[PDB]
């Protein structure tokens, strides 16, 4: 069984036992959360229009982090314009527990 869930304005195919980084969520580490399901597949196939009324994926919050730093660098020629920015994207790491059909 696999599900396509939606969190952080993005969609991911998840199965039980998957670890996944998503956009940060207000959930204590160790809390468990329920993600909405767009489509079920594997054994049976259920198609959301757009979301499946019963379905949910249960995920355990493993913790929150900050991604590896990206250098945002800006430069315009002949105008003495330079900008240096450090960006670290917050994230939440999830452990997918079960797909509740």
């Amino acid at each position: 069984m696999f599900a396509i869930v939606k969190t952080g304005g993005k969609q991911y195919r998840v199965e039980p036992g998957l670890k996944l980084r998503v956009e940060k969520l207000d959930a204590e580490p160790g809390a468990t959360v329920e993600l909405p399901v767009l489509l079920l597949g594997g054994e049976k196939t259920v198609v959301g229009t757009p979301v499946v009324e019963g379905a949910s994926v249960v995920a355990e919050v493993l913790g929150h982090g900050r991604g590896k730093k990206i250098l945002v660098s800006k430069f315009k020629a002949k105008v003495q314009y330079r900008r240096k920015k450090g960006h670290r994207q917050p994230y939440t790491e999830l452990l997918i527990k079960e797909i509740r059909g």
Binding site: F2, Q11, L38, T45, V47, G48, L71, S73, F75
Partner: protein, 116 residues
């Protein structure tokens, strides 16, 4: 009191030269050419972070198109059908289904054909 340069410029130049590791010739060896290369590289990375989102959408769409044509419709009919059926699986996941779950993608083609 006097405040000579001392250690300050060497340290500043070494930060730049370390970022330029791997560049060709004086672009990784000379502080001046390294910094000019880094200027371009920073603008490129910013521009290509943006451009990467488009590149991957093109690839999804091309793959989605080919999976569609195995079932006798084209991409643009398939997308319209999903819109009318209310399905909102995105192109990243449609392209993954097209390759990894051909049965599921076929049922999606079914829904799209039926919606019009």
């Amino acid at each position: 009191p006097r405040a000579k340069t001392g250690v300050v410029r060497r340290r500043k130049h070494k930060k730049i030269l370390k970022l330029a590791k791997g560049y060709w010739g004086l672009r990784s060896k000379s502080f001046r050419k390294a910094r000019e290369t880094l200027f371009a590289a920073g603008n490129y990375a910013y521009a290509h972070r943006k451009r990467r989102k488009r590149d991957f959408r093109r690839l999804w769409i091309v793959r989605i198109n080919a999976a569609c044509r195995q079932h006798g419709l084209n991409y643009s009919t398939f997308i319209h059908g999903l819109k009318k059926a209310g399905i909102e699986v995105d192109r990243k996941n449609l392209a993954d289904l097209a390759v990894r779950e051909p049965q599921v993608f076929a049922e999606l083609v079914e829904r799209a054909k039926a919606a019009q």
